Design a protein around this ligand. Structure first.
Ligand SMILES: Nc1ncnc2c1ncn2[C@@H]1O[C@H](COP(=O)(O)OP(=O)(O)O)[C@@H](O)[C@H]1O
Ligand code: ALF
Ligand SMILES: [Mg+2]
Length: 673
C-alpha cells in the first residue's frame, strides 16, 4: 500500500518506475518511483502532531489533515507551529467551558487548539520572562481573524473586569469600520493589525494597544462586482433610527453612488442587527452617545461626498444639494467648499471628481485612525503580540493596495522561514551542538528585495517613489530596472510579481497618485476649522515609504519576541464548508513551508531546556541520579539523563541547555505524572 499522485485528490492510496493499482478506481497505473510516497500505519489516524508521523511526506500530511478535518478537528500541531483549516461552519469547540479545559494545559495534555497556542504562549511569557507573539498566516479567507479573535478571547478569560469586557469589543468595533465583503471573504479585514496585550509581572492583563496597517481607503468610493464597502456604511444605512436617518440626512442603498453594487446582502448577517451590535460595542468601549453620532455623521458625509456631481463645458456642479448636505454634515460653508473644490487654478470634471474622491478616502482613513486611537485610549511588564495581517489576495484587478498587502504576506512568510530554519540552526551551533546546517531551500529575500530595495538596485516601491510622468511611464522604468529579476514578469501599465503564494499581475493605474495621496489643502483647511469639533479633530513621505517604516518597526518588535505561527489553510475557494480542495491545500502547505517546518522539527532538536530546569522538573524521575549536595547543572543533567537511560540520539548537551528531540520532554512529562 502506498501514496500515488492524483487529480481529484492530491494523492491516492495504491498498492505496489512502479506499477500500482489504485484502491478507489482500481485502475492499475504505472508511475515513476519518485512519484510514490509511503503511507503510514493505521496507528497514525489523525495524529495531533505530524512531527510524530513515521513517514513525513506531502501525501501523509495532506491525509492526516483531510481526515481530522472531516472528523471535525481543524487544529493540528505540525512540529513547533500549528495548522488550522477553515471549517466554514460553526463547531462546538470555543465554549468557555472548553477555555477552562485548556487552562494551563501543556500542548501534549490536550488536543490541538488555538486556545493551547494562546495559553502556552501565555505561560511561556511568564516562564521565560520573554515577550511572546502569536502570528496567524493565511491567504485571504483562511481564518487569521477568527483565530486571532479566539486568542484574545482566551487571554481575556484567564488573566483578567472592564478592560477584558472592552478588549472583546475592540474588533467588533474595528471590523465595522475596516472590514468589508470581498469576493474572497465576506468579513474581510481591509487592514492589517497587530494587537499587543500588556500584562503585569503577575501575569494579569494590564493594557492593550492595537496598531493597524494599510487600510484600503479606495474601497470607500468603489467596489468590484459582488463586492461591498466597509460594513459600517451598510450598517448605518440599514439600521439607523428614523430620527438619525434624517438627522444624518441619510439616503437609501441606491441613492448613494459610493455604494457601487447597491445593497449586497451578506450570508448570515443582518445589517440592522450589526448596527445595534456595533453601537453596543462602541458603548461598552466607552464611546459617548455624541462620539457615536459624530462618528456615524462622518460616515454619512463620506457617502454624501460621493453624490456630488460635476459637469463639463472647466467643471461646474449645477446641483449643489449634495455639496450642501456634505457641508451641513461637516460644519463647512457650501460656497467656500464649492469654491475650493471647483477652483482652489481651474478644475475640470475629471479633476473635480478626483479631489472629492480623494477627500472621501482621506476622510474615512482619518475616521478610522481616530476610532482606533479612541479605542487605544480606552484599552490603555510583558506583552503578547497577536498579528492579523491582511491576507494574500489576487483579485481580478490588483492595484497598489494588493501589492502592499501581498508584499507584507511575503514578508511574514519569510519571517517564518527565517525563524523556523535559520534561527533554529543558528542557536544549535551557537550552543555548541553537533550540528551540520541544512539548507531547507526556502528564501523569499529576492522578491522581498524586488519590492523594498530602497538603495542600490531600485525596487518596485522605490522606483515608484522616484517616479512621482505617466503611471505607465512608471511601469516602463520598473521593467528596465527589474524586468529580468527572477520574481518579475513583463505583462495596460501591468506587470507580474511571482509572490511565494502565487503570481499576481498588478495594474499600475493611478499608482503615482495613490503613492502621493494628494488632497485639496483648500477644502482640507475649511475642515481644519469646521464649526464641528469632531470634524476639526479629524483634521487637526510617500505612502509606500511610510508603510516600509511601519512594517520594519513591526518586524523588529516581532524580532524581539518569541513567535508562534498559526498557519491558516483555506479549504476551498467556494466559501464552502466540508469541501477540502486537496490541491489548493497542497499548494498552501507548499509555500508555507509546513513540510520543511516539520522536517527541521524532526531532523533537529525543537525542545531545549536549561540544565537547572531539567534538573528540577525531572530529578524526581531519577531521585538517586544526582549527588546529595552540590551538583552543577550540566553534570547533574548528564547524570539524570544517564539515570533515565535516554538514547543519545534523543538529545544534545549544549553550553547552557540540553536540546531534546520532538516529543521527548513530552514523554518525560507524562512519566512525571
Ligand atoms: N474556526 C472557525 N470557526 C468558524 N468560522 C470560521 C473559523 N475559521 C474561519 N471561519 C470562517 O471563515 C471566514 C473568514 O475567516 P477570516 O478569519 O475572516 O480570515 P482572514 O482574517 O484571514 O481574512 C469567517 O467569516 C467564518 O465563516
Ligand atoms: F480579512 Al483577511 F486575510 F482577507 F484577514
Ligand atoms: Mg481578517
Amino acid at each position: 500500500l502506498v501514496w500515488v499522485p492524483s487529480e481529484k485528490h492530491g494523492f491516492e492510496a495504491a498498492s505496489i518506475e512502479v506499477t500500482v493499482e489504485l484502491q478507489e478506481n482500481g485502475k492499475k497505473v504505472t508511475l515513476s518511483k519518485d512519484d510514490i510516497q509511503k503511507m503510514n500505519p493505521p496507528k497514525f489516524s489523525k495524529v495531533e502532531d505530524m512531527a510524530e508521523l513515521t513517514c513525513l511526506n506531502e501525501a501523509s500530511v495532506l491525509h492526516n489533515l483531510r481526515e481530522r478535518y472531516f472528523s471535525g478537528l481543524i487544529y493540528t500541531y505540525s512540529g513547533l507551529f500549528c495548522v488550522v483549516i477553515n471549517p466554514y461552519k460553526q463547531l462546538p469547540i470555543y465554549s468557555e467551558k472548553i477555555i477552562d479545559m485548556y487552562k494551563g494545559k501543556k500542548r501534549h495534555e490536550m488536543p490541538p487548539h488555538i486556545y493551547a497556542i494562546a495559553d502556552t504562549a501565555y505561560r511561556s511569557m511568564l516562564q521565560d520572562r520573554e515577550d511572546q507573539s502569536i502570528l496567524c498566516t493565511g491567504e485571504s479567507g483562511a481564518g487569521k481573524t477568527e483565530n486571532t479573535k479566539k486568542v484574545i478571547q482566551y487571554l481575556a478569560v484567564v488573566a483578567s473586569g472592564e478592560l477584558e469586557k472592552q478588549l472583546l469589543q475592540a474588533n467588533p468595533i474595528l471590523e465595522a469600520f475596516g472590514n468589508a465583503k470581498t469576493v474572497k471573504n465576506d468579513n474581510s479585514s481591509r487592514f492589517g493589525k497587530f494587537i499587543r496585550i500588556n500584562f503585569d509581572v503577575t501575569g494579569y492583563i494590564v493594557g492593550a494597544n492595537i496598531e493597524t496597517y494599510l487600510l484600503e481607503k479606495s474601497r470607500a468610493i468603489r467596489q468590484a462586482k459582488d463586492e461591498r464597502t466597509f460594513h459600517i456604511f451598510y450598517y448605518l444605512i440599514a439600521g439607523a433610527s428614523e430620527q438619525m436617518r434624517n438627522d444624518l440626512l441619510l439616503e437609501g442603498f441606491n441613492n448613494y453612488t459610493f455604494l457601487s453594487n447597491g445593497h449586497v446582502p451578506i450570508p448570515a448577517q443582518q445589517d440592522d442587527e450589526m448596527f445595534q451590535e456595533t453601537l453596543e460595542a462602541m458603548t461598552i468601549m466607552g464611546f459617548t452617545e455624541e462620539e457615536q453620532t459624530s462618528i456615524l455623521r462622518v460616515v454619512s458625509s463620506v457617502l454624501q461626498l460621493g453624490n456630488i456631481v460635476f459637469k463639463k463645458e472647466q467643471a461646474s456642479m449645477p446641483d449643489n444639494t449634495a455639496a450642501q448636505k456634505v457641508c451641513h454634515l461637516m460644519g463647512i460653508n457650501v460656497t467656500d467648499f464649492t469654491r475650493s473644490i471647483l477652483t482652489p487654478k481651474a478644475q475640470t470634471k475629471e479633476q473635480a471628481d478626483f479631489a472629492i474622491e480623494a477627500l472621501a478616502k482621506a476622510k474615512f482613513e482619518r475616521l478610522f485612525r481616530w476610532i482606533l486611537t479612541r479605542v487605544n485610549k480606552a484599552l490603555d511588564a510583558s506583552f503578547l503580540g497577536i498579528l492579523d495581517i491582511a491576507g494574500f489576495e489576487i483579485f481580478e484587478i490588483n492595484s497598489f493596495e494588493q501589492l502592499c498587502i501581498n508584499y507584507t504576506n511575503e514578508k511574514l512568510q519569510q519571517l517564518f522561514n527565517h525563524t523556523m530554519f535559520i534561527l533554529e540552526q543558528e542557536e544549535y551551533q551557537r550552543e555548541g551542538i553537533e550540528w551540520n546546517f541544512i539548507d531547507f531551500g526556502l528564501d523569499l529575500q529576492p522578491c522581498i528585495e524586488l519590492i523594498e530595495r530602497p538603495t542600490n538596485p531600485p525596487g518596485v516601491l522605490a522606483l515608484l517613489d522616484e517616479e512621482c510622468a505617466t503611471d505607465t511611464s512608471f511601469v516602463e522604468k520598473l521593467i528596465q530596472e527589474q524586468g529580468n529579476h527572477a520574481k518579475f514578469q513583463k505583462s495596460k501599465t501591468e506587470f507580474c510579481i511571482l509572490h511565494y503564494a502565487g503570481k499576481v499581475t498588478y495594474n499600475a493605474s493611478a499608482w503615482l497618485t495613490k503613492n502621493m495621496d494628494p488632497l485639496n489643502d483648500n477644502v482640507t483647511s475649511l475642515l481644519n476649522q469646521s464649526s464641528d469639533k469632531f470634524v476639526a479633530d479629524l483634521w487637526k513621505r510617500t505612502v509606500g515609504q511610510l508603510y516600509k517604516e511601519q512594517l520594519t518597526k513591526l518586524m523588529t518588535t516581532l524580532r524581539n519576541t518569541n513567535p508562534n505561527f498559526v498557519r491558516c489553510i483555506i479549504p476551498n475557494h467556494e466559501k464552502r464548508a466540508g469541501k477540502l480542495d486537496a490541491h489548493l491545500v497542497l499548494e498552501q502547505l507548499r509555500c508555507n513551508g509546513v513540510l520543511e517546518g516539520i522536517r527541521i522539527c524532526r531532523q533537529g532538536f525543537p525542545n531545549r531546556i536549561v540544565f537547572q530546569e531539567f534538573r528540577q522538573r525531572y530529578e524526581i524521575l531519577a531521585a538517586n541520579a544526582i549527588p546529595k549536595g552540590f551538583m552543577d547543572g550540566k553534570q547533574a543533567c548528564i547524570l539524570m539523563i544517564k539515570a533515565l537511560e535516554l538514547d543519545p540520539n534523543l538529545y544534545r548537551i549544549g553550553q547552557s541547555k540540553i536540546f531534546f528531540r520532538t516529543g521527548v520532554l513530552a514523554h518525560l512529562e507524562e512519566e512525571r505524572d
